[PDB]
Ligand binder design. Structure first.
Ligand SMILES: *[C@@H]1O[C@H](CO[C@@H]2O[C@@H](C)[C@@H](O)[C@@H](O)[C@@H]2O)[C@@H](O[C@@H]2O[C@H](CO)[C@@H](O)[C@H](O)[C@H]2NC(C)=O)[C@H](O)[C@H]1NC(C)=O
Ligand SMILES: *[C@@H]1O[C@H](CO)[C@@H](O[C@@H]2O[C@H](CO)[C@@H](O)[C@H](O)[C@H]2NC(C)=O)[C@H](O)[C@H]1NC(C)=O
Ligand SMILES: *[C@@H]1O[C@H](CO)[C@@H](O[C@@H]2O[C@H](CO)[C@@H](O)[C@H](O)[C@H]2NC(C)=O)[C@H](O)[C@H]1NC(C)=O
Ligand SMILES: *[C@@H]1O[C@H](CO)[C@@H](O[C@@H]2O[C@H](CO)[C@@H](O)[C@H](O)[C@H]2NC(C)=O)[C@H](O)[C@H]1NC(C)=O
Ligand SMILES: *[C@@H]1O[C@H](CO)[C@@H](O[C@@H]2O[C@H](CO)[C@@H](O)[C@H](O)[C@H]2NC(C)=O)[C@H](O)[C@H]1NC(C)=O
Ligand SMILES: *[C@@H]1O[C@H](CO)[C@@H](O[C@@H]2O[C@H](CO)[C@@H](O)[C@H](O)[C@H]2NC(C)=O)[C@H](O)[C@H]1NC(C)=O
Ligand SMILES: *[C@@H]1O[C@H](CO)[C@@H](O[C@@H]2O[C@H](CO)[C@@H](O)[C@H](O)[C@H]2NC(C)=O)[C@H](O)[C@H]1NC(C)=O
Ligand SMILES: *[C@@H]1O[C@H](CO)[C@@H](O[C@@H]2O[C@H](CO)[C@@H](O)[C@H](O)[C@H]2NC(C)=O)[C@H](O)[C@H]1NC(C)=O
Ligand SMILES: *[C@@H]1O[C@H](CO)[C@@H](O[C@@H]2O[C@H](CO)[C@@H](O)[C@H](O)[C@H]2NC(C)=O)[C@H](O)[C@H]1NC(C)=O
Ligand SMILES: *[C@@H]1O[C@H](CO)[C@@H](O)[C@H](O)[C@H]1NC(C)=O
Length: 1771
């Protein structure tokens, strides 16, 4: 159908809103019928035929435009359809659009609002909104010109305009709709799912069944999006109506009369929309100060005596109580303006009694007046009123309408009649003269008849029975109210029914002006309309004592604040039913924070006043406690009412009004604020002692303690005991306080105070409004104090913006409380720049960081300034003098620092006290954040080493959900950046929703904060003192999450964990045996830290200049570098094994080593002649000690010259070939430095000079010479000569290649190619399999260059010399000059000073490429010097150890650290390198070293042989045994190397990587894991035959026996004889293994196997990767086998993921399967499915130890054919 063209079933507008859906009715109305569809979806919907058209054009006017609309021909719905309608639009203000639709010919009813008056002016300019009117069918659309977004759209449905039916539908930009009342929505946000709400004032209980209540409010707010952009709509119409929400999203107003008079209000935030609305309808009244106290009331006190007893009881309990209410009891025969002469005799005396105790009296007054006035018994109110003719009349307009209420037959005053107001005033005056009351409570002002219409009933008119009736209760407009044809001054009851309460409140406000002189009073009303808040407060009606009503109280209160009636609350402890102690207690707790706080009970229920529950009840104690807190904060509350009254702010506020940037705050309705500063979190559930609460993104302080909470922008479970409610102060605000008393009268004479809650930038602001609190128009007559407080830079400024009032009580501020500060000291108070004599006494709690400045008196009404200076603790002290020499008080005062000789060790003597840089221009983007940093203190910065940089930029980038980068650099000048490429995402994916972190840039001092979203833990905090960015001195510090830090190397440490007791460690490559506090071969600026909850993160600083790190016990970490920029990468975790996978993804994953390189290796410096290496080979085979690689040191080279062959090793080439034929492999050593003193042809140097590959001076062009190993030709070398003498007499001059350069790369590769294939003689060709590149620091035996010496000392001995070795010899010690020049690939020139630590890294990749070219296979590189991203192409060995006992444990620590650094192939020299090995030590070391990934026995020259065959038979047996274990496990070990290469897993893992929950594992460094499954527990001590090992919580099987040991989380003593190493397998894992042999070549041709360790559940899992083990890129080119295996339900299944290597032509045989933990029951049978072939294997089950051994060698089963193995246990 074409008329029925509706895009979306959700955009259907119901055409039958009255009766049930029937095709008969729809066909009659002309609406399309479509019953197919979902629930609540309307089958009947209007067609395009319905509506109006604009005939002509938009005639313009002075205020806007006018348009004539005629009715599109269509069937009438309810009849009397107006045909000609006029539209008038008025651009009243830049943010307020008004339009009105009315009849063109006839005049209709319009609301006579007292405040809103007709607009006389011209159109405003410029406007923030655009109005576009569609001509056919007619529609109006308001558009936000700023972002071109439609806010109001009336096109979704037709305009309907009949006499007794008007309709308009509006499409909305979002579903965030708040407002529309008065009903119980049970939630602040509005459910847009086909819900309809009636609006018609009515006396009924707030049951919660969606019924019309006592008031009529048509305003709603809509929040467009997270920018804060918002708008509001208000309809000025007093007729009965209903509002229909639709999941379009869309709202629709359906009314029974009047005109459509709309206002659209725009604002940048929700609060601005509310302010716009309240400025239009009228600003709220300022209440008297006493009305903010607590109020007590009860329906039936029966007698005055009972009332008096309640008063006395509560007074005696000392409960904060100020106002006592009186219900209709006092009134005799419930008649107004009268009191009971007997039961309530003495009522006047009660009023006086209250006043003498500083308490108040509020009396109730009803609108209905009785008619029983006879000459015998006169009733004055009635007689005087009848004389004035001020009653509501019957339709005849003359006869008073008679209704029935409390007094019985009654008449109703017409408050819209001016004469009525005069009568009303007089009545109050006479009664006030009898009883001296203080305020008025008006009730049943809906109006409310106990009968329907009148005592005579209602006429049959279209007013009493209209054609359309909203979904009102009962269904009759005259039910429990007056007849709709009754006549008043403003019109008929049909039009003014919703205005009765409004009109009465106006009249009462007038009466008060006369009765009470210059004394604003209090009018509490029930019935309300828009604009009532200017005159009265409101209470939410007759609730019941249930847990639902408790919950519903909060959204009700929040909506009324929108409507401009801030003085509002519900009845505490319920009005109907009986309350329980818990409900009344939990209600008194939250009720203490209602704007209007009153306990009100009904008739015939248990007394519920707090003192009723007993003088020492928990309820009374709790009530007294929180009511005292309310009284302390009344100055703060009163000022909030001032801002509502003056500007239109809310008092009790929803979270979304402050924290709209987040979407988690757009639904909260169980938590609220007082103004912007105080968050209230109640318990609203029966029996609960915990709440789920959302904490928004701010600093929050616990009100009761003052301590900061750690929660931010997250949900929490809060522990709230029966007598506690959640209260928190927001940082950045100042709160005025006043010492509390039992009444407001006694409290306003007590001293004042301030609470200062500081924020992230250590700043706060506040206001105090002060006045008499009783007089009227104080603000209008400008008779009041207004203060403005502000804190910044440890200075408070009080400042009086208006002072025309003087307080008679001589009040003073006596205390100042500061939250989130360091200890304040030297407090100076001055008034108007005039010193005030005072002795401020400060008291600081160190843990909560809370201070109380007392002994001060700030006279209210005068300007002042209080300044303080702060004390720094000894743990937060940052060294201001890290220079090598010059430490003195004179040198500190100059730098601008403080000097204190701390007796405590470690604590610095000269510390920092001020900041050098300021922050500005902070901008947060979707995928980043930036800021400008500018030097403030030029002089002090200059005193610090080097020249200061002035302008800096901070850039933060959100690369991924778990990774981010932040960088600080000079935007004006290029400074050196490390040329090591990293792998970052090209397009940022740090989407706000997915990302694991948040960033915050702070000020005073400057700093960056990074926080983990899930737990709210801060993982990086830089707001410490010391940030410096000089040219050659950059410093920055961070606060560590916990005391656990692992990483930073390469430097020997006593442990895996780092000691943070004032320790400084340098980093700059040097040829120095690893030692304590000694810079070594590699520089890795990376750490991983554990948070206290066991979450983990990692941080990389990408910098290559010389540097150091200091560990303060704050915990704090400081970095100091000698150049470059600051470039940080952070990995968010969340587990210790995912930070390594994240790190290696960024730097590059480890290299895959050749299978043969996992065998055992032999090396020895001092090989005399070739025939010796031959002898070793033969002897090794004889004793059957398995080995795979034989190394050759500089001995094979002539005079230690590279690319030469010594005459002593003439047969070497032949030997290499013979060994290789038997499956052995050979690695050769190469040094980088090339000799320049050769007399005979030396191609390397000659061609190097021609290709210019050597490092030369900046411009001079001379080669920087040095002295390493190469010797001089034609001299005799005497070993006796001291080393110093040899370096000076025998060592030659050498040149160092620049490996960054393209020419150098070509020369180097060609030289290695000629080494493999000798061009001069093929007989001299050396067929190597890998390369060992050593002395690549670079390293020299002469500091700087050869003598004369170096040139530029500025670089050699820099301004700041990091804490390295020989700290007085400078950077050039044992290395090149720092001025040497190098050339990057792109041609740019750099200094050795910047790239020194990247020299080994620069050589590594070229070497790797050439080896893979000459050999045609994978190859292996081993490098001494390493830098982040070196593990991508090479392994590393832990350098020159010594044969000593402490060196065994140091090796374990070293290999765990290099795994974190992403270098998986690593190991130490077995049996030591220096000194001579000892039998026991060399034996114990052989056992340990059998489990290093790089397992090599290496010794120095002139030392006892350490080779397995250099000892006796006892050793040969120990060595052979352990090495056979190694060769057995190689398939498992090789699979581990594969996963690391492909996923970034670790091979030698720590225990905390697998068991992070056990905190015992956080300090273990004497045991380790290979992969997840294999635990190694060595003996590391002399003469020890037992080892104490900790077994984490799991199933641990002994490797040798296969028996499970019961040690789950316990220590145990393991037997460890000299010939044994303790090994254990973790249950739940499957290990592939293979039979051992002399070399891998032979072993790869034997049977495979699978040890299966079942867990407690009886499940196990494992992997196998298999390839050739030699070819390049086997995985990238897809020639490999990869499979995952699983064991469960007594069966094992193989899941080949990829197979292109294992075939029938190339089989991998499987022969043995051992299952551990199968249980004690005998095993009936075992079956193997070989590609559809069942095989019965040989088997044996020893139920003593529970191990099934399955043999299948005869089965001839290849792995590719295996599918599954099943075993059935005996029933
Ligand atoms: C309810 O409170 C009473 C009285 O407590 C005192 O007053 C409070 C307002 C607060 O200032 C407390 O620190 C005071 O102790 C508790 O009862 C005992 O009352 C006697 C006499 O006043 C007092 O000396 C004791 O110290 C109080 N007992 C204690 C502290 O154990 C009473 O325990 C509270 N109610 C409940 C249910 O615990
Ligand atoms: C108060 O109003 C009621 C209702 O109008 C009056 O009661 C009626 O009085 C008339 C005589 O005037 C009787 O014929 C009716 O039977 C009464 N109606 C009832 C009882 O429903 C009453 O007289 C008024 N009292 C006055 C004016 O003093
Ligand atoms: C408190 O301090 C303020 C700021 O110094 C004073 O306010 C100024 O008063 C002068 C009086 O001639 C006015 O011209 C200025 O407009 C005011 N504001 C500013 C910003 O200068 C105020 O007088 C002081 N109040 C005292 C001394 O009680
Ligand atoms: C090769 O080197 C070996 C070892 O240096 C030489 O012979 C032995 O040297 C050791 C001392 O290193 C002595 O203890 C032995 O007595 C030597 N043996 C002999 C038979 O002299 C050997 O001479 C060298 N020459 C070659 C192999 O040409
Ligand atoms: C290595 O140097 C030492 C020390 O200079 C030489 O030893 C001396 O040789 C002379 C030869 O005439 C003897 O008179 C001395 O007694 C030796 N000792 C000392 C302490 O002077 C040694 O000869 C050199 N070795 C060589 C050249 O092979
Ligand atoms: C191999 O040499 C080792 C080291 O000298 C011998 O070990 C010692 O043997 C004695 C006598 O049995 C024991 O008292 C010592 O405790 C052993 N020391 C160590 C460190 O174990 C060993 O006996 C020799 N083996 C052979 C077969 O001679
Ligand atoms: C493990 O070894 C330790 C250290 O040798 C043994 O403890 C000592 O045993 C001797 C036996 O004569 C006692 O004299 C010492 O007092 C013991 N020292 C300590 C610190 O206890 C221990 O008995 C061995 N325990 C085993 C194998 O379970
Ligand atoms: C063995 O490998 C297969 C294939 O990679 C794994 O199965 C997949 O598992 C993922 C993650 O649970 C699922 O999304 C896929 O649907 C699975 N693919 C299939 C069944 O073809 C399997 O989980 C691995 N087994 C073990 C124990 O890791
Ligand atoms: C696995 O099964 C095979 C076949 O039954 C066993 O090998 C045979 O062992 C017997 C006894 O030593 C010899 O007579 C045969 O010559 C062996 N055959 C071969 C081909 O070597 C083997 O011992 C079993 N393995 C285990 C650990 O039980
Ligand atoms: C070494 O092992 C062999 C083979 O088991 C054995 O015969 C010999 O006695 C062992 N030697 C020692 C000293 O234990």
């Amino acid at each position: 159908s074409a008329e029925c063209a509706v895009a979306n079933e959700l955009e259907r507008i119901n055409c039958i809103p009255d009766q049930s859906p029937t095709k008969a009715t729809c066909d009659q109305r002309g609406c399309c019928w479509k019953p197919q569809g979902a629930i609540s979806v309307p089958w009947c919907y209007y067609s395009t035929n319905h509506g109006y058209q604009v005939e002509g054009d938009l005639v313009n006017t002075n205020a806007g435009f006018t348009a004539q609309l005629k009715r599109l021909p269509s069937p009438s719905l309810f009849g009397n359809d107006i045909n000609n309608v006029l539209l008038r639009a008025e651009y009243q203000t830049a943010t307020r659009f008004h339009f009105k639709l009315t009849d063109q010919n006839q005049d209709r009813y319009e609301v006579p609002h007292e405040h809103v008056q007709p607009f006389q002016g011209n159109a405003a300019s410029p406007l923030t909104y655009e109005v576009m009117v569609s001509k056919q069918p007619f529609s109006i659309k308001v558009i936000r010109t700023s972002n071109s977004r439609v806010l109001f759209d009336s096109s979704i449905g037709p305009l309907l305009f009949a006499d007794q039916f008007l309709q308009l539908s509006i499409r909305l930009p979002s579903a965030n709709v708040y407002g529309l009342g008065e009903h119980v929505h049970q939630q602040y946000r509005h459910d847009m799912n086909w819900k309809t709400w009636p609006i018609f004032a009515r006396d009924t209980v707030p049951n919660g069944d969606g019924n019309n209540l006592y008031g009529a409010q048509t305003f709603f707010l809509c929040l467009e999006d997270a920018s804060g952009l918002s708008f509001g709509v208000f309809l000025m119409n007093s007729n009965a109506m209903e509002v229909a929400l639709q999941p379009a999203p869309a709202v629709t107003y359906r009314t029974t009369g009047g005109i459509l008079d709309f206002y659209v209000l725009l604002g940048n935030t929700p609060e601005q929309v509310v302010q716009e609305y309240l400025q239009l309808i009228g600003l709220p009244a300022l209440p008297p100060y006493w009305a903010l106290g607590f109020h007590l009331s009860r329906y039936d006190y029966e007698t005055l005596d009972n009332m008096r007893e309640v008063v006395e009881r509560n007074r005696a309990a000392q409960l904060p109580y100020d106002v006592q209410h009186a219900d209709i009891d006092y009134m005799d025969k419930r008649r107004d303006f009268t009191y009971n002469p007997v039961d309530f005799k003495g009522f006047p005396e009660l009023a006086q009694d209250l006043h003498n105790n500083g308490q108040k009296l509020v009396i109730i007054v009803d609108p209905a007046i009785s008619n029983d006035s006879s000459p015998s018994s006169p009733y004055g109110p009635y007689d005087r009123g009848s004389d004035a003719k001020i009653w509501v009349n019957d339709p005849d307009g003359v006869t008073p309408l008679i209704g029935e209420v409390w007094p019985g037959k009654t008449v109703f005053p017409d408050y819209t009649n001016p004469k009525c107001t005069t009568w009303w005033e007089n009545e109050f005056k006479l009664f006030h003269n009898q009883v001296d009351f203080d305020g008025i409570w008006i009730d049943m002002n809906e109006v409310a008849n106990f009968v329907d219409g009148s005592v005579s009933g209602c006429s049959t008119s279209n007013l009493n029975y209209p054609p359309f009736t909203p979904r009102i209760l009962d269904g009759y407009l005259f039910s429990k109210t007056l007849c709709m044809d009754a006549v008043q001054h403003w019109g008929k009851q049909y039009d003014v029914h919703n205005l009765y309460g409004y009109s009465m409140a106006i009249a009462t406000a007038e009466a008060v002006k006369t009765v009470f002189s210059n004394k604003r009073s209090f009018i509490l009303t029930r019935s309300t309309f828009a604009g009532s808040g200017k005159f009265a407060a409101h209470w939410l009606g007759d609730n019941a004592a249930t847990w639902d009503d408790l919950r519903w109280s909060i959204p009700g209160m929040l909506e009324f604040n929108l409507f401009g009636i801030p003085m509002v609350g519900s009845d505490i402890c319920g009005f109907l039913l009986d309350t329980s102690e818990e409900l009344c207690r939990r209600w008194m707790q939250v009720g203490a924070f209602y704007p209007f706080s009153r306990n009100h009970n009904g008739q015939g229920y248990k007394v519920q006043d707090p003192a009723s529950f007993g003088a020492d009840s928990l309820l009374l104690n709790s009530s007294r406690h929180y009511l005292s807190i309310r009284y302390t904060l009344l100055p703060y509350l009163y000022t909030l009412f001032y801002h509502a009254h003056s500007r239109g702010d809310t008092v009790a506020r929803p979270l979304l009004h402050e924290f709209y940037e987040d979407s988690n705050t757009w639904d909260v309705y169980q938590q609220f604020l007082w103004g912007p500063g105080l968050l209230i979190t109640p318990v609203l559930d029966e029996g609960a002692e915990k709440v789920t609460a959302y904490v928004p993104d701010a600093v929050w302080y616990d009100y009761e303690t003052g301590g900061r909470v750690t929660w931010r922008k997250q949900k929490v479970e809060m522990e709230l005991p029966g007598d506690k409610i959640g209260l928190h102060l927001r940082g950045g605000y100042i709160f005025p306080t006043q010492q509390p008393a039992t009444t407001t009268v006694a409290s306003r004479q007590n001293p004042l105070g301030l609470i200062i809650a500081l924020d992230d930038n250590k700043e706060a602001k506040g206001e105090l409004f002060w006045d008499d609190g009783e007089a009227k128009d104080t603000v209008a007559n400008k008779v009041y104090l207004l203060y403005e407080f502000s804190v910044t830079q440890n200075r408070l400024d009080v400042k009086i913006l208006q002072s025309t009032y003087t307080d008679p009580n001589n009040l003073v501020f006596k205390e100042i409380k500061i939250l989130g500060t360091q200890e304040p000291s030297n407090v100076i108070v001055k008034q108007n720049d005039i010193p005030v004599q005072v002795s401020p006494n400060v008291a600081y709690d160190s843990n909560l960081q809370v201070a109380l400045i007392t002994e001060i008196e700030l006279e209210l009404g005068k300007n002042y300034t209080v300044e303080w200076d702060v004390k720094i603790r000894d743990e937060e002290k940052i060294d201001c003098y890290p220079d090598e020499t010059g430490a003195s008080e004179g040198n500190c005062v100059a730098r601008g620092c403080a000097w204190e000789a701390s007796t405590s060790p470690g604590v610095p003597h000269c510390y920092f006290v001020d900041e050098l840089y300021s922050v500005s221009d902070v901008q947060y983007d979707s995928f980043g954040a930036t800021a400008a940093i500018s030097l403030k203190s030029s002089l002090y910065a200059s005193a610090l080493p080097s020249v200061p940089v002035n302008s800096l930029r901070l850039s933060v980038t959100y690369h991924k959900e778990n990774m981010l980068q932040f960088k600080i650099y000079d935007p004006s000048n290029n400074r050196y950046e490390v040329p090591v490429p990293l792998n970052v995402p090209r397009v940022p994916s740090g989407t706000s929703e997915s990302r694991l972190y948040d960033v915050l840039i702070k000020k005073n001092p400057f700093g960056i904060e990074i926080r983990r979203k899930s737990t709210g833990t801060v993982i990086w905090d830089s707001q410490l003192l010391g940030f410096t960015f000089n040219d050659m001195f950059i410093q920055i510090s961070t606060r560590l999450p916990s005391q656990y830090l692992y990483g930073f190397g390469e430097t020997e440490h006593t442990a895996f964990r780092r000691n943070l007791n004032w320790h400084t460690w340098g980093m700059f490559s040097r040829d120095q045996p690893p030692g304590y506090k000694m810079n070594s071969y590699g520089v890795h600026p990376y750490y991983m830290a554990l948070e206290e909850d066991g979450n983990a993160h990692g941080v990389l600083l990408l910098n290559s200049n010389a540097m150091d790190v200091t560990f303060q016990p704050l915990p704090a970490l400081t970095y100091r570098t000698t150049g470059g920029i600051l470039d940080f990468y952070v990995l968010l975790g969340p587990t210790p094994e995912l930070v390594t996978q994240q790190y290696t993804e960024l730097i590059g994953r480890p290299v895959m080593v050749p299978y043969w390189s996992l065998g055992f290796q032999l090396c020895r410096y001092g090989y005399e002649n070739d025939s010796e290496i031959a002898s070793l080979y033969e002897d090794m085979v004889a004793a059957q000690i398995p080995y795979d690689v034989q190394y050759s040191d500089i001995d094979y080279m002539e005079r230690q010259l590279d690319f030469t062959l010594s005459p002593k090793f003439d047969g070497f080439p032949a030997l290499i070939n013979r060994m290789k034929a038997n499956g052995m492999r050979v690695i050769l050593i190469l040094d980088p430095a090339i000799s320049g003193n050769e007399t005979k042809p030396y191609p390397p140097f000659t061609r190097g000079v021609e290709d210019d590959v050597f490092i030369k001076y900046p411009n001079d062009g001379s080669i920087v010479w040095g002295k390493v190993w190469p010797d001089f030709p034609d001299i005799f070398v005497n070993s006796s000569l001291d080393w110093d003498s040899q370096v000076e007499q025998y060592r030659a001059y050498v040149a160092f290649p620049d490996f960054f350069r393209n020419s150098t790369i070509t020369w180097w590769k060609r030289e290695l190619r000629e080494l493999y294939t000798n061009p001069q003689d093929p007989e001299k060709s050396l067929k190597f399999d890998g390369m060992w590149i050593d002395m690549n620091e670079p390293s020299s035996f002469v500091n700087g260059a050869v003598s004369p010496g170096c040139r530029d000392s500025s670089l050699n001995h820099p301004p700041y010399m990091p804490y390295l070795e020989s700290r007085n010899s400078g950077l050039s010690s044992k290395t090149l000059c720092m001025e040497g020049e190098q050339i990057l690939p792109d041609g740019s020139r750099v200094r050795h000073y910047d790239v020194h630590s990247l020299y080994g890294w620069s050589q590594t990749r070229p070497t790797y490429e050439v080896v893979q070219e000459v050999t045609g296979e994978r190859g292996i590189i081993i490098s001494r010097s390493t830098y982040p991203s070196s593990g991508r192409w090479s392994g590393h060995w832990l350098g020159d150890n010594t044969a000593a006992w402490d060196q065994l444990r140091k090796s374990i620590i070293g290999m765990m650290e290099f795994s974190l650094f992403g270098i998986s192939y690593t190991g130490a020299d077995i049996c030591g390198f220096f000194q001579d090995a000892e039998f026991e030590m060399c034996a114990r070391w052989m056992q340990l070293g059998a489990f290093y990934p790089f397992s090599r026995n290496h010794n120095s020259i002139g030392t006892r042989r350490q080779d397995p065959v250099s000892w006796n038979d006892t050793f040969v047996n120990i060595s052979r045994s352990v090495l056979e274990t190694r060769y057995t496990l190689l398939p498992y070990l090789y699979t581990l190397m594969h996963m690391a290469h492909t996923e970034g897993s670790t091979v030698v893992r720590a225990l905390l990587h697998e068991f992070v929950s056990d905190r015992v594992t956080w300090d273990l460094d004497s045991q380790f894991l290979l992969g997840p499954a294999f635990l190694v527990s060595p003996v590391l001590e002399p003469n020890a035959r037992n080892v104490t090992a900790y077994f984490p919580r799991a199933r641990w099987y002994d490797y040798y026996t296969g028996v499970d040991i019961n040690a789950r989380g316990e220590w145990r003593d393991l037997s460890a004889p000299l010939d044994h190493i303790n090994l254990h397998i973790r249950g739940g894992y499957i290990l592939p293994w293979q039979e051992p042999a002399q070399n891998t070549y032979f072993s790869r041709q034997k049977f495979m196997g699978f040890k299966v360790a079942l867990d407690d559940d009886g499940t196990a899992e494992g992997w196998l990767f298999w390839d050739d083990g030699q070819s390049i890129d086997t995985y990238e080119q897809g020639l490999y086998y990869l499979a995952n295996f699983s064991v469960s339900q007594n069966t094992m299944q193989s899941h080949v993921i990829f197979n292109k290597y294992i075939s029938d032509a190339n089989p991998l045989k499987l022969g043995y399967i051992e299952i551990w933990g199968v249980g004690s029951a005998p095993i009936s049978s075992v079956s193997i499915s070989a590609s559809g072939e069942v095989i019965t294997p040989i088997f044996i089950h020893d139920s003593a130890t529970q191990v099934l051994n399955i043999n299948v060698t005869n089965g001839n089963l290849s792995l590719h054919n295996f599918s599954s193995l099943t075993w059935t246990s005996a029933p």
